[PDB]
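Q: I have nine molecules that I believe assemble together. Could you output structure tokens for the complex as a whole instead of separate predictions?
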Amino acid sequence: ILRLLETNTVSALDSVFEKYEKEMNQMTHGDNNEVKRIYSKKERLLEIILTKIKKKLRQAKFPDIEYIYSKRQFIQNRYSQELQNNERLEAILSREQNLLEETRKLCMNLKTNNKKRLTEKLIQKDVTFRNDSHELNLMLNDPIKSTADVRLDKEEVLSLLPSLKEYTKKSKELKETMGQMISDSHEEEI
Amino acid sequence: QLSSSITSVTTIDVLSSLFINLFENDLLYKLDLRLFQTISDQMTRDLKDILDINVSNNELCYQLKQVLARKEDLNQQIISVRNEIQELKAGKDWHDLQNEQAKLNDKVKLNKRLNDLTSTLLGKYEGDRKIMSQDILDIAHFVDLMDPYNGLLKKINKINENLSNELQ
Amino acid sequence: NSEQLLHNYVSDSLLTTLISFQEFKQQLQSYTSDEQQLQHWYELLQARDARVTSELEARIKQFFITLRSRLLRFLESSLSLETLIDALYKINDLLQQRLQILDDAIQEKTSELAEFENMVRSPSAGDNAIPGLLQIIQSYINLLEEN
Amino acid sequence: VERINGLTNLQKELVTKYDTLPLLNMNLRLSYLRDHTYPHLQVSVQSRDNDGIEVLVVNYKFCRNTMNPFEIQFSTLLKWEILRISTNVRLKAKQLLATRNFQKCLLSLYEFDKIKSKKTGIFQNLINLLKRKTRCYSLIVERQINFIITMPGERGKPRNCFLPNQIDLDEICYGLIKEYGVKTGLKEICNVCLFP
Amino acid sequence: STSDRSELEDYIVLENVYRMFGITFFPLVDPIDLKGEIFVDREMLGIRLEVFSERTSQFEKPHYVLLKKRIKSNSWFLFKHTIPSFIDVQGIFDDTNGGLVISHDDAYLFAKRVFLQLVEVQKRRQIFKDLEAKKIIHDLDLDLESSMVSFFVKDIKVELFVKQNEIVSCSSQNNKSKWEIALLGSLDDLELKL
Amino acid sequence: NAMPYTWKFLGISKQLSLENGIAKLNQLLNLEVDLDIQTIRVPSDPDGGTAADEYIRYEMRLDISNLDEGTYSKFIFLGNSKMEVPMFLCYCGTDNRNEVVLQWLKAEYGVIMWPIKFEQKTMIKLADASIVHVTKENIEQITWFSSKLYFEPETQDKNLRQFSIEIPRESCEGLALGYGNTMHPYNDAIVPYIYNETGMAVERLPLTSVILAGHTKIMRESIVTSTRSLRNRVLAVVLQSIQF
Amino acid sequence: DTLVVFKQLMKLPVTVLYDLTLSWFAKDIYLLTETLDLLIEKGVRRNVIVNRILYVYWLNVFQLAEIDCHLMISKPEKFKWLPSKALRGDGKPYVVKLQPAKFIENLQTDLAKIYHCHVYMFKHPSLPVLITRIQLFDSNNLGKPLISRRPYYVAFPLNSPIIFHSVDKDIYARLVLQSISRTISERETIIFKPVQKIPVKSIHNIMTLLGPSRFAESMGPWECYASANFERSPLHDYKKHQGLTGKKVMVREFDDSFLNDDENFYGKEEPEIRRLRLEKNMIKFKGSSRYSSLVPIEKVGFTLKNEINSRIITIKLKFNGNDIFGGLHELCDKNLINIDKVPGWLAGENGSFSGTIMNGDFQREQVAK
Amino acid sequence: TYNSISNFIENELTALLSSDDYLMDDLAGELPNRLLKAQVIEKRKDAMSRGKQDLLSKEIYDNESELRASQSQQIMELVGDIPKYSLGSELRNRVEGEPQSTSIERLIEDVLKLPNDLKVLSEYSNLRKDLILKCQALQIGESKLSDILSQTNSINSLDDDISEYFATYNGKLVVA
Amino acid sequence: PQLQALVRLLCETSIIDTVTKVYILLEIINHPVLQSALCKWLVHVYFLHNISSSIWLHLWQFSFLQKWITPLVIWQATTPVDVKPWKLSIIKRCAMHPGYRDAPGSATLILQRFQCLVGASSQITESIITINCNRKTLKSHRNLKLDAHFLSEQLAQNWPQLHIPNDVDYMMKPSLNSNVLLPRKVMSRDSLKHLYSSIILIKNSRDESSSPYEWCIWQLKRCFAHQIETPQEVIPIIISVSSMDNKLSSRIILTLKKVCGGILPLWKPELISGTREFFVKFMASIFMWSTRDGHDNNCTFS
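A: Yes, here they are, computed for all nine components at once.
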């Protein structure tokens, strides 16, 4: 019973340290006591009776604590971090289910836009441009898609454009003076 | 099992109680008294604590394992959520928004501009009787560039063609 | 960490104090034997297997407290008009950037059409062009009229 | 079960075509070529030994136009000239051939012919309406819908933006040129001329 | 013989000029043809696809796009081809005339669309990999279609992203505003910056 | 391969009728076993020219307490004297009694034996012989199932190994009626069909094992079925196979 | 662990690649160059290089120090794939992509599973980058390290519609795919990769089969359009003999079908006609131990919905094998299948798509897993 | 039952003493070995023990408060339901400066501003407006270059109608 | 007395099972053990005629093999092992179906084995005695025609069959002349006959021939050495001389071995032709001798 005697020795020593704590507690709760040489001799007598009981227990050998704190705390900490991970993933599914019902609401709003284009076409009930625009070739123009109006551009027209349009009007009057000469060539073939 | 140390604790309690009877038979002894009953009850609840702590950890191990399976439900669940939130921007790319800007501008914006223009020129329905002028750089360029080269060479070779008519 | 705090609370600051509550009944009430009630406390509340009752309390109360935190999450789900004006200003600014880019490239197209052709076409003269044109035109018109 | 070689006569190889390659010459190459690229082409070879070569690009929709090249090597990387132009275009062709690269050039000259053709093909069946219609140089004479033919130095292939109570007309015509076809855009402009 | 061997050589030089025209068609038939009278019930246009370089001023590996007569009704839907799939064939195909492509001219402008779509890829690789790669010492590398392009200017690493010959991305306020530019401005701005 | 009745085949040198020494077999193995003897004039639909249809399938009917194919172990011995090899031996199951049966069959008659690793034309012929179901009117209707003509051509380097051809029952009737009418649907339609489609001369092919659906697994030499019997025209053509 | 890494590091060659690995693994280093110089000339005791560096300079930050094993067993081919398109809700694809923006999905999976690494790579004949991507997931036992469970790969080529991720079909596999869906979005664009053909083989013969190659459909009887092996350039007299080319008289007669299906006899022909049979085979399956394929297709299943007499005619046709179509000219050389009536779809031109053709209308059968 | 389960926990804790001296099971012979003074001492004990439930009422609210605070650090660290994206990188790091995409995303942030995330980074919005104004000056510079390049052509480049009409009519009448 | 007689043979052997198996099979005609069952095959031939043993072989084993049998080789090997060292009944009965399936779709590899069976079968030429020249000449002719017919490898197999059956039949005639009762007259007959057939074969094999050279050499030696060791064939001196115009064709050919054979034929001819008549046969023989001597005075270079 080697492990039995070892655990008994360790547990009795832990009880001896807690006995020292209890002896200090009784000394603090005592009238006037400061020697404790009787306490040390009592610890010696306890060790003597402990060895005698160890003889009696090794005779009747009829056939782990900080280890317990350690393994218990090991699995507690593992469980706690596992729980932290759980609420993290719970946070992320809460965020994305919030997002799922958001975009689901917006696709229902697109369905309301379907009913609204029915109503908005009901107020006034009255494709091959790709094939033609690449049959010939043409260009398109889009300074639009802005909710604020763009005819008030004359804020930021100021950079070079009014000077530009004045000089183009000057060139327009110059080409009018050049196109005076067409008076011969109006209807030379009509 | 722990019944052995339990029996040893019982024997230590009996002997410490005999010494307690001797001490309290003559009275000092308060310290020794609390010493050996602390020995006794500490030994008891410590052996009791370690054995049922073995039991408790041996079960909450597998309750932890159950919450690991709960984590697995989390991962499958967020796969499904992220999946559907992904292809829900596919049906929003789809026909809904497409027909929205395919008929919205069609029978709102352009028909707005058209009916505004018909309110203008139907409101002055006399256009063939009033103006017809819809009230330039391109005509400027093609006229002012067809004149000095093409007009000159066309005229001089047309007059030389008249010379070919005249001699021949 | 929260579960760590909660079992540390329930184990330490409750059950160790309950054991202290047990042992302070020998010391200062009287001088009697004062242990009979201690073993009857043992024998009676050995249905509180305190480790197991503490862990069951943890695996109840920590969980519904997290449910309560889920409840009290919801909080959101003046002077901003200046930045709203700044945003509308940048809206005009970039719409102007697009429109000015189109007008810039169109004017550049007019430039590349006009300047290069009119310069390198007649070998860079720009003399009195319409005068010579009308002169040869009147001469050719007189020749054709005589024809 | 014979084994002759094959340079011509469809029937023979059209039986004995167990491969899949380009078919072969006889004319069905060049018939597909000419008949599915409509204005024509002529040559003469002028070998050397490194090969000066001519061509006669018969541009052919109604009024002719042509061109002629210079030498190659047999490795096909040598240099090229223009030696005959028709005067329907004088200097816009030199805008083009200012640069090299005959692929783009020829295509434009080709698609440019198709552009002139479709320009006329729109103008005749808009003139067909027998109301107050009058005639202009290159646009219309009613109420001034012009449009350029740029043959630019940006993208290599000629693109044609349009022109049509001024800016209003601009965005309206840009709108209506997205629903009912270009061949009917004149019919639409007729509609805003006919009733109002 | 040599009686019409000159005639054949004339025809193939006519072919050579017709294929520097670029897009061409050319008949072929795959051996699915029942009946020496012989039916052909599936016909192939077959569109060879040829690009002119400048840097060598050659022609390349031509591409090839060959469609075929659909069984039911007089159509031309796609068959095997080869242009590398960073260019779509299928969508830009059936885009034209609703996928309902019958004549040869709509087929022609189909291949035209493919062609110039191919060729400005060739043009911008012909810009990068030649001109400032060799004039400027440059230590260049690039993508298959030239879109992440990164190099030394002479000194340092600059990435830029390209689109329809217009620069969008760049890798300083100096740097960024000098280079969100057009392609013809790119070589000029590397001339200027030094 | 989900059906029990395994029917390895065996040929006979010369015919000897059997009812003489059925006491001898019943003597040697001590177990009463019926020998049935019955004339059938297959082609029972007479489109075969009526040429020596004396077909007397001897049925060693091992009729004991039915606990196995080692208990029900029926044999069929089809004979025709006016054909050169006269007679073959089928046998079902997996019994150990069959060994001394055939051993005695060698012994008491003095006949010599060989198995039949039969071939492609064989497999196709009896394949569509399997689907003509026997009617009591003897004008026999045509069942249909779904073929799964597993091959296994080795080539060099195991490159091809194995390639199926599976036909839905619908398409079986399709190519039947489009032929049109026959009693030889496979060689009349289906192998002509797939020759005209995939150019696969399945006659010439290294076939290994046609499965027909839920009903047989014709193999390289060993027809397996899901019936305690073999159809008589099937037995006729497998006699026809080995002949000359 | 050390057994596993020894199974890996025995597959390696030695030459100087071990030297460069251990060089940056060691990031002493002055005279470590003179350790490794001698161990270059003592590059002899080949297998025990492993444990000696694995003990001298020796699962937390060590991951890149082992993942170069993947970097260099990319040398061989052994493992598998499967492809996946990249749609946008219209059938338009793209994968135009700047390289280093992979911290994005690094952080994005790090929001959802624990700290983690993935080297990128770059193959050096074939121009993808590939993402060896190890999911560090767990640590449990019922000891402080974490589990590197399953290196899932995503290789994508430059500028394709296609990526091909590796084949695991798991709740971590699909999770990483779900992440890499969204982290390549970047514009609130919509990616949602759907799947193609299920089986596969290795890298070169997946990208030349499909992706950003020029064989998008060029293979089968058509590789003379893949290569440009005729009609060279503007040249002159090569094209004259290219207009003076050979051929068999492989007559398309039905009587020829009687000659081929029926009418079996002896050799009775010179090596010319035997040659012409052989290149009928060759031109049918390639287009020119030589007798393999170009590309190992591994198993396919074709289908055939004819309609005949206004009535559907349906045969299915599954293959197996270790490379088919090379197997089929090695079958057809034996004059076992009668070559002129071999249509294209089982001539093998589609590149391993088990499609369901019907009256010449080959398809793909989308068929998600 | 936040502190109520613990309230029943401490109640069942003291109820051992309550049921013990209430039955007086050992207390019947303990006077031999507090008549009711023992139970008086017992509820003295339990009134002392209610300090623990005072600590419950403290620490439960402490825990819930700090977890609410952690939730506050979460919403401050993540985007507060703001999926806005390339500015959503731009406010944290430069990537490339795509004026196309920054322009277009700038055409989508101006939706319903007054009619979160750190007052929506008005400084980064001002930085983008400043950068766009810098580009606007960069474009206007080339506009001035075009103006000054076109102006040097106009100055350099810049009766007989009826006379030529009479001459052409005379040509018609003298040739036709 | 065969009950106790074969039991006495059991007293001289150790194989009771085969004894009782004779008294009641395919085990035996599959295979101490092997020689003992061989003696059982002999004993079955004794106690039978040849039926109950031989019928196994001479119908069913080759007539599997004409269709197919698996190993295909050990069966035919034992077949020849049985019938070759045994009865002319088995021999001629086998040879009937041999010539027939020869004229029918011959398998051209089994017919090699049947040719070996004939090659020992001086039993065959023995027991026929009536018109073997009919049967064997017809078989040789059919093989020649069909060899050219599946010729037009094709030509090499034509060479292989039409020469190998020839060599085997020549060995058969060699055995016939070893007996030579009336087999001498038939030996002259078939000897000149197959010599002529191989001569026309060499007319289809003039400048392209491989094996048939050895065949004609075999024929010539089978004339020559037989006539040298047996000078009793003076009525067959016509046959011994009869290689004249064929010998022109034979010296008309590398033919080193052919010339060696011709030298042997002519040398034994000049030896045993001194007893012949100096008018008709030996005049032609010495004429050939003079022609070959002129060929020798031409071989002094050529």
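A: One point stands out. Residues 105-134 of chain E form the longest helix (30 residues).
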